[PDB]
Amino acid sequence: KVFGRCELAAAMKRHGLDNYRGYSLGNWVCAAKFESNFNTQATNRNTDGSTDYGILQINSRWWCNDGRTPGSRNLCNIPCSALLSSDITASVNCAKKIVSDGNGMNAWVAWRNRCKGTDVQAWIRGCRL
């Protein structure tokens, strides 16, 4: 479904993502608003011929298999359809491997553009931890 803001904040909380690699919970939930608008079924088609998928827009040319993307790798080792499921476990598991790569949160373009260097805690305020 579409997640409520604070609903998602506790979902990715229990998945061990707060201060993961140095990136606070806010940096993850903020990413999700501009990447997918909290939508678990969000998808986009890039010019390349690869596909963007799920809550954090994990692109298929590197990370997941959808059978529609030629000469590509499958680094997180999942089908791309699992990134569309309402339970966010496969999206979190893979994003943990994406962020570790070496570029950090710069892997997400909507994060880099709209979230980096801002008041990232407004994003968590109101919710109960």
Curated annotation (Swiss-Prot):
GO MF assignments: beta-N-acetylglucosaminidase activity; identical protein binding; lysozyme activity
Recorded name of the encoding gene: LYZ
Stored PANTHER family: LYSOZYME C
CDD domains, A to Z: LYZ_C
Active site feature: 35, 52
Keyword annotations: Allergen, Antimicrobial, Bacteriolytic enzyme, Disulfide bond, Glycosidase, Hydrolase, Secreted, Signal
E.C. number(s) listed in UniProt: 3.2.1.17
Disulfide bonds: 6-127, 30-115, 64-80, 76-94
GO biological processes: cell wall macromolecule catabolic process; defense response to bacterium; defense response to Gram-negative bacterium; defense response to Gram-positive bacterium; killing of cells of another organism
Family matches, as SUPFAM superfamilies: Lysozyme-like
Protein name: Lysozyme C
Oligomer status and interactors: Monomer.
Species annotation: Gallus gallus (Chicken)
